[PDB]
Design a protein around this ligand. Structure first.
Ligand SMILES: [Mg+2]
Ligand SMILES: [Mg+2]
Ligand SMILES: [Mg+2]
Ligand SMILES: [Mg+2]
Ligand SMILES: [Mg+2]
Ligand SMILES: [Mg+2]
Ligand SMILES: [Mg+2]
Ligand SMILES: [Mg+2]
Ligand SMILES: [Mg+2]
Ligand SMILES: [Mg+2]
Ligand SMILES: [Mg+2]
Ligand SMILES: [Mg+2]
Ligand SMILES: [Mg+2]
Ligand SMILES: [Mg+2]
Ligand SMILES: [Mg+2]
Ligand SMILES: [Mg+2]
Ligand SMILES: [Mg+2]
Ligand SMILES: [Mg+2]
Ligand SMILES: [Mg+2]
Ligand SMILES: [Mg+2]
Ligand SMILES: [Mg+2]
Ligand SMILES: [Mg+2]
Ligand SMILES: [Mg+2]
Ligand SMILES: [Zn+2]
Lengths: 83, 81, 52, 66, 146, 239, 90, 101
RNA sequence: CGCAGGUCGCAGUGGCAAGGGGGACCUGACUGUUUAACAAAAACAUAGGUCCCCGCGAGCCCGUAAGGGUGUGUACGGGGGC
RNA sequence: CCGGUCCUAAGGCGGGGCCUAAUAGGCACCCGCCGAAAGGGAAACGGGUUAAUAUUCCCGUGCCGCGGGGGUAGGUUCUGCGGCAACGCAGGCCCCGUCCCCGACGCCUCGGGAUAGGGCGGGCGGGACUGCCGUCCCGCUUAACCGUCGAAGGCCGGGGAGUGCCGUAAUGGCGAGAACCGGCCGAAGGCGGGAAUAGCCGGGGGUUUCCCCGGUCCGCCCGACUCCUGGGGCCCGUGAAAAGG
């Protein structure tokens, strides 16, 4: 745990306590947000900051939800209706 | 599984102030086995067990008794004090 | 530099640890066998006739 | 610990508390419902606090001053 | 025991600031627990010396003098103090937000705004006062800009 | 001790090997692609000599091919005998018309592609000899060979041409390239060593060596190895 | 307005007969106004706070939320004290 | 005009994306009223932006401002009822960033 | 950041901190590397030039063998000299 | 709830097989496993206490995983509701499959937002000094966790622009949809709750560390090498994987 704090994997956060001491808290970085399977851009509705796995994220109310953006879904539906 | 009691200055202070008995057990005893042994032998209730292995290779357990049983009374009854 | 200054770097690493079979400080952790009794590479005990 | 602003919402937790702690100030009163999971705090006008405190006692909820 | 080690923990100060009265030399040998030290602190036989804060009286006097223009001559500068790149950022924002406001209020037509915008970017104007004078001299607005 | 550098390379020490874990996978034809696919990505692969295209077939099979010059993400390509000879399409060689520039040419069907894979290279389809299932192609070196007419090639030229025309201006630039490749960088001349370390090492005025025969044993077979000739006269006789 | 998302959810929950959710959304509306207005006052952004307090007074009337009025009065009292100190210092 | 009363459409955005519906009314140049009967396809009756529906080559004969059962009787007249229950399936694996720039 | 004025010292980047400069020849282009413990160089490397072996079941190399490295590579490439 | 333990990396070991006079020698193949106390990765903070341990003991306030009980929404042939939309909202229960994404990534440079820390003026309390002046110094703190707010950026609806029009630190942008108007998603961190009852400072009384009393404030400034965000550039160099979610 000391060399583990010499690496920059964790955030170094300096905080003052109610006891008057200034300490360093080593905190996790945010996980990356879900990305569109086509464009790789963050998906709307799910790009909130999350700091651990195992947290349920609600996908937008749309077919294919948090898998592709609305732009990809609409275009793909337009292609299928014709075809 | 119990080898002896610890009756040092620290151990006696934890008996009076925190209702804990301190024992030396076999090094392979687990917290589950330690709690069962103390309850069976002495008819008390164990709240929790903290364990450590001393630098001389012996396993020491700080055994906190539940809130109806006295660690000081048990040591007196056993005649180890 | 090869003498006293370089000896300073022998303070933290290791090639061998204690062998569970023979008990000597001869178990090569990288090679995963004992340099004395051969444990980990040889189920027979290593001992050569050129050794007294 | 959690903060609740509406009295009607707070009373659902206040009625189930192991103890309600009262901290008095000049302009408002903190009522803290200590439940097994959370400490629920509400700030109320002092007149409202007396009425709320009376109801909790009538429901045999323990009330202590801190 | 080392009483200063215990006293420093209790007083929450450095060992370098713990003072033990010489009148309590007889009682130092009897100290066993931190509570024994707490007895001596309560009796005033052990206390903490106040920490030193470097005095700023000389600095505050000098700070006022420097605000009036003193002690910042050629012989007192050893390196670069003016950030030229930061100065450009301020100069652009000062000029652009003035010109962009005049256009938003209708006081400047977009054609005249573009010429001045490019002239500001081209380092034509020394400062906002120079820009105002140019606008007033060349009647680029219906009414003079203050 | 005395084994020379070319002899130590064959032992496969770490400094002589290819760091192929830096790449996404081999750039080869799968054995059973057919139909239409889509170019879904075009990627730089460390240590390779050309950009790589990721192609997704209709049945979901993905494979890597070297990107034809002009290929674009989202392009629809066709694989098989029915495919028109358009750039990026993968065709059996017996179906490719003569005079067509192709790349990633299989020598036998299913070997994945062997010839004309470096950036800017291409092979020319010279002739067809279908009574024995062979296609005649010219390779980038100018050599003319016969290949299995059932083997696959891609239409066009390999993208990324012109890379070697720009100089590696600094030693450091080639150093970074070498780290993505297998090359040992840098190299020491043989005559800069002592005799124990090279046949050319040694004398007060160090010299190169005269050519060795083709039968020379390893450790002797350095310098010119059974060369037909050397110098400008050899180039002139080559022509 | 800042806390309009909560106003809509209250109407939506009430129109669906969800009394428990309507109460929870009512709580969230007050949290949105009070927490944001309190932060503005603490940072002495009195103008931003006053627009929140004005809107807070309207939705308190709209939904009959007594606790909103009590907390708005507290924050207004703190605002005037800040303004008093500024004018005297000026 | 394509988006007219009786033209069958498939909504492309929103919660109801991929579901068939029928234009029953025209509001303005941006909005038409679609109600592909909720009990049939799952699209409730409300206005919709013309950019959020894709027209289908199928069209039915109904009157302006038609109601839900009038639409229902017309769909069975054209025999498209089971058509109005199928939901369009996108093929997401054939989409590349070029199509949605 | 600037201007006007007054004024003291031998000395005002006053301590601290802090380039001597110029002309020419030989030599290696340059940055880099080296004889751990007497050699730091004009030696090695280098980018660039050029030649050779090679169309891949290749060329060159390792292994008694099974097999292996170059090679998840393919002449705008791999290897070998100067 | 701090690390190991789990995962895979470069790589390694064992069984099978193939090779070997033979092995304890070799390994391309099949199967499995090992391989990081600086990579990935569940969950704890503050105060107090000891002669010696302290995110481990004690007090307070929480979190994670797994399992269960009650209530509720919801369900009980069949489907949750709202919004043009971006998307919002308690969004039924169990099992199985497939796909996608997160995990998951360089260097250089420049705009923006914070916090740690530092300072200035006033106030209250306490301390330093004595030749003259009356200045100088110290305290005035606020954890995790719950809620709410959200800059850049992206997106949705309206709009329909070339006498152009809108810009930046810089590059600039627009019928391949600008200005402008309204909205949606959305950091560090702020603020309330935690929480003054703690800690600190000052003044008293006890006894063996306990009790009481007063203060814990007002208004500004600088501000990171710490934390967040976005823009631009470079590469014959392209900056891991898997568990897990
Ligand atoms: Mg780690
Ligand atoms: Mg990380
Ligand atoms: Mg332990
Ligand atoms: Mg040596
Ligand atoms: Mg080693
Ligand atoms: Mg000076
Ligand atoms: Mg410059
Ligand atoms: Mg290498
Ligand atoms: Mg030599
Ligand atoms: Mg020789
Ligand atoms: Mg010879
Ligand atoms: Mg020679
Ligand atoms: Mg000096
Ligand atoms: Mg040199
Ligand atoms: Mg030497
Ligand atoms: Mg030397
Ligand atoms: Mg040389
Ligand atoms: Mg030359
Ligand atoms: Mg020669
Ligand atoms: Mg492991
Ligand atoms: Mg210690
Ligand atoms: Mg002050
Ligand atoms: Mg700039
Ligand atoms: Zn051994």
């Amino acid at each position: 745990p000391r060399p583990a704090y010499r690496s920059r994997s964790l955030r170094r956060v300096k905080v003052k306590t109610p006891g008057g001491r200034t300490v360093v808290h080593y905190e996790k970085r945010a996980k990356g947000v879900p990305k569109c399977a086509v464009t790789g851009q963050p998906l709307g509705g799910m790009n909130s900051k999350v700091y651990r796995f195992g947290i349920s994220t609600r996908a937008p109310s749309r077919p294919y939800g948090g898998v592709v953006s609305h732009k990809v879904l609409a275009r793909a539906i337009r292609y299928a209706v014709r075809r | 599984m119990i080898k002896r009691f610890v009756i040092t200055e620290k151990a006696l202070r934890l008996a009076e102030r925190e209702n804990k008995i301190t024992i030396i057990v076999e090094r392979t005893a687990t917290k589950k086995q330690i709690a069962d042994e103390v309850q069976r032998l002495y008819n008390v209730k164990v709240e929790k067990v903290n364990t450590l292995i001393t630098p001389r290779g012996e396993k020491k357990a700080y055994v906190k008794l539940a809130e109806g049983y006295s660690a000081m009374d048990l040591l007196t009854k056993l005649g180890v004090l | 530099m090869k003498g006293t200054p370089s000896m300073g770097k022998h303070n933290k690493g290791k090639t061998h640890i204690r062998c569970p079979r023979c008990g000597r400080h001869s178990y090569n952790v990288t090679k995963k066998y004992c340099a004395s009794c051969g444990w980990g590479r040889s189920k027979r005990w290593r001992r050569y006739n050129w050794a007294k | 610990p959690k903060e609740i602003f509406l009295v009607e919402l707070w009373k659902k937790y206040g009625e189930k508390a192991q103890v309600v702690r009262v901290k008095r100030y000049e302009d408002f009163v903190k009522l803290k419902a200590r439940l097994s999971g959370y400490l629920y705090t509400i700030r109320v006008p002092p007149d409202k606090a007396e009425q709320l405190i009376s109801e909790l006692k009538a429901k045999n909820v323990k009330v202590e001053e801190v | 025991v080392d009483v200063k080690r215990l006293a420093a923990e209790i007083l929450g100060v450095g060992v370098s600031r713990v003072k033990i009265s010489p009148e309590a030399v007889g009682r130092l040998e009897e100290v066993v627990t931190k509570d024994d030290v707490r007895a001596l602190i309560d009796e005033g036989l052990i206390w903490a010396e106040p920490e030193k804060g470097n005095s700023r009286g000389r600095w505050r006097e000098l700070h006022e003098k420097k605000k009036k223009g003193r002690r910042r001559g050629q012989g007192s500068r050893k390196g670069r103090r003016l950030d030229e790149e930061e100065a450009w950022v301020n100069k652009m924002r000062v000029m652009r937000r003035f010109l962009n406001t005049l256009k938003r209020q209708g006081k400047l037509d977009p054609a005249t705004w573009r010429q001045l915008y490019r002239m500001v970017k081209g380092n034509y104007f020394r400062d906002l006062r120079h820009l105002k004078t140019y606008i007033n001299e060349h009647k680029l607005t219906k009414e003079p800009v203050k | 001790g005395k084994r020379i550098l070319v002899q130590r390379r064959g032992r496969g020490g770490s400094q002589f090997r290819s760091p192929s874990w830096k790449r996404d996978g081999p750039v080869r034809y799968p054995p059973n692609i057919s139909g239409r696919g889509i170019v879904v990505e075009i990627l730089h692969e460390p240590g390779l000599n050309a950009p790589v295209a990721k192609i997704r077939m209709e049945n979901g099979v993905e494979f890597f091919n070297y990107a034809a010059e002009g290929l674009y993400v989202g392009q629809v390509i066709q694989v098989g005998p029915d495919a028109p000879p358009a750039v990026g399409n993968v065709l059996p060689l017996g179906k490719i018309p003569e005079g067509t520039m192709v790349f990633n040419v299989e020598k036998r069907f299913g070997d994945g592609g062997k010839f004309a894979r470096s950036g800017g290279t291409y092979a020319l389809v010279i002739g067809q000899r279908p009574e024995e299932n062979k296609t005649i192609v010219r390779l980038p070196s100018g050599r003319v060979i016969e290949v299995d007419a059932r083997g696959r090639a891609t239409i066009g030229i390999v993208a990324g041409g012109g890379r070697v025309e720009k100089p590696f201006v600094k030693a450091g630039k080639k150093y970074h390239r070498a780290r993505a490749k297998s090359w040992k960088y840098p190299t020491v001349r043989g005559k800069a060593m002592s005799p124990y370390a090279h046949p050319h090492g040694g004398g007060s005025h160090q010299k190169g060596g005269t050519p060795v025969p083709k039968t020379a044993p390893p450790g002797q077979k350095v310098g010119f190895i059974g060369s037909r000739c050397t110098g400008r006269g050899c180039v002139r006789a080559r022509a | 307005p800042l806390c309009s998302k909560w106003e809509s959810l209250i109407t939506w929950a009430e129109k669906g007969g969800n009394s428990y959710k309507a109460l929870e959304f009512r709580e969230k509306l007050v949290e949105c106004i009070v927490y944001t207005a309190t932060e503005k006052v603490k940072k002495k952004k009195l103008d931003e706070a006053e627009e929140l307090l004005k809107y807070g007074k309207e939705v308190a009337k709209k939904f009959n939320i007594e606790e909103l009025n009590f907390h708005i009065a507290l924050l207004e009292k703190e605002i005037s004290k800040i303004r008093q100190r500024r004018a005297q210092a000026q | 005009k394509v988006i007219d009363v009786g033209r069958v459409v498939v909504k492309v955005l929103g919660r109801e994306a991929g579901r068939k519906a029928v234009v029953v009314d025209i509001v303005d140049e941006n909005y038409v009223v679609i109600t592909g009967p909720k009990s049939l396809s799952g699209v409730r009756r409300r206005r919709v932006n013309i950019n959020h529906i894709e027209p289908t080559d199928k069209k039915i004969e109904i009157k302006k401002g038609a109601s839900d059962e009038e639409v229902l009787k017309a769909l069975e007249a054209a025999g498209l009822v089971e058509y109005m229950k199928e939901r369009v399936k996108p093929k997401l694996f054939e989409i590349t960033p070029a199509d949605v720039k």
